[PDB]
Amino acid sequence: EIIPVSTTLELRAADESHVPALHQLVLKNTRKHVQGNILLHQRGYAKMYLIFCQNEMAGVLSFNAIEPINKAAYIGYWLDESFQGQGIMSQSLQALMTHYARRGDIRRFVIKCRVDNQASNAVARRNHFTLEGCMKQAEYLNGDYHDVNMYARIIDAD
Amino acid sequence: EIIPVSTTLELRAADESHVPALHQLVLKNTRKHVQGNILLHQRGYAKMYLIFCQNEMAGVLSFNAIEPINKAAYIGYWLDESFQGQGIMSQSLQALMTHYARRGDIRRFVIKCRVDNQASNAVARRNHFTLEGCMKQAEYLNGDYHDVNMYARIIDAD
């Protein structure tokens, strides 16, 4: 399952064959994790895609969870250190969302990220997500509960 | 497991013994559903409590899901027709939240309800929840996707 993104970028559904290489990147920046995500991916309970840039694995773009009935997905992503700040996530995400709007099984795309997560907030804004609210102390990290921005983009009928 | 609420109200953790009676109320307004919720309840993945008023079963008060690490719970509830509009959910919920703040495993209590759900919005406001945002077209119901208010109350340290 490949989702074209651009001349140099493409998303590939996470496969058992990727485990070796991703683990390398995980470590640098698993099988059970991947096998587990593949099962959700086949059931439409989540999606796990690998981002390839000029054929090199560069990071992961996920729908952490999906609410089939509400046709809603929460987005999660991470990029290897040498592939950050280059719009690879922005172009990959717009392509992925367009592709699912065309499939039709997802219409509401959601990004929940810490208010202090400078990188995720910028992806949300560059990709025209609307800030719907701020969940107080919603995410525990490093001993504290941090506020989280909830962003959404709808792509379906007018 | 009983959580006192008041002179006449109390919450009882859903038990296999309740199936017969709840099913009656479900029908009026299951075992698999209950057995399934009991398992999540024992693991702290959700909670399902039965609301009793003067010893008669009157409805259900649930933590539809829990995020153990974030110590966050999403609230769900329903009352039999003859027990609505009487603050039974409001008193039961304040008691339940206080009880969990004392246990300490939950500090962020969340109510997501349709903007047009007059009853749930009033419970949220009467129980001092803060409206954190409005999720656009987030809940499918009767052929349409409806906007949903997200409310939260934190009960932990100052």
Exposure string for B115-145, b = 16+ CB within 10 A, e = fewer: bebeebbebbeebebeebbebbbbbbeeeeb
Rounded to 10 deg, the angle between the B19-28 and B31-43 helix axes is 120
Write down how long chain B is.
158
Query: Which of B69, B107, B145 is nearest residue A70 as measured by Cβ atoms?
Result: B145
Of A106, A111, A117, which is closest to residue A133 (Cα–Cα)? Answer: A111
Half-sphere exposure of A60 (CA within 13 A, CB side): 23
Question: What is d(CA A142, CA A25) in angstroms, rounded to the nearest whole number?
Answer: 23
Helix segments in chain A, DSSP class H: 19-28, 31-43, 88-103, 118-126
Structure tokens at A17: 């064959």
Check: CB of residue A124 under 8 Å from CB of residue A149. Answer: yes
Calculate the CA B6 to chain-centre distance: 17
For the purposes of burial, counting CB atoms within 10 Å of the CB of A39, is it exposed (0-12), middle (13-18) or buried (19 or more)? exposed
B157 touching A, CB under 8 A? no
Give the distance from residue B76's alpha carbon to the nearest chain A alpha carbon, in angstroms: 17
Structure tokens at A134: 């701020």
Query: For the domain B1-158, what is the CATH code?
Result: 3.40.630.30
Q: Beta-carbon neighbour count of residue B57 at 10 Å? A: 17
Most A-contacting residue of B136, B141, B149 (CB-CB within 10 A), to test interface: B136
B133 touching A, CB under 8 A? yes
A139 touching B, CB under 8 A? yes
Check: CB of residue B60 under 8 Å from CB of residue B48. Answer: yes
Question: Per the CB < 8 Å rule, is A150 touching B152?
Answer: no
Most A-contacting residue of B108, B111, B147, B149 (CB-CB within 10 A), to test interface: B108
The answer for residues whose C-beta is within 8 angstroms of residue A10's C-beta and 6 or more apart is: A2, A3, A4, A52
Alpha-carbon torsion B50, B53, B57, B60, what sign? negative
A152 touching B, CB under 8 A? yes
DSSP tag of B7:
S
The answer for residues whose C-beta is within 8 angstroms of residue B18's C-beta and 6 or more apart is: B12, B34, B50, B57
Residue B70 phi, psi (nearest 5): -85, -5
Angle at A33 between CA A126 and CA A148, to 5 degrees: 35
Q: Under DSSP, is residue A111 helix (H, G, I), strand (E, B) or coil?
A: strand
Question: What is d(CA B100, CA B130) in angstroms, rounded to the nearest whole number?
Answer: 19
Structure tokens at A156: 């379906």
Determination technique for this PDB entry? X-ray
Question: What is d(CA A44, CA A65) in angstroms, rounded to the nearest whole number?
Answer: 9
Check: CB of residue B91 under 8 Å from CB of residue B85. Answer: no
Alpha-carbon torsion A98, A100, A105, A108, what sign? negative
Structure tokens at A88: 């690879």
Q: Beta-carbon neighbour count of residue A95 at 10 Å? A: 18
Q: Under DSSP, is residue B22 helix (H, G, I), strand (E, B) or coil?
A: helix
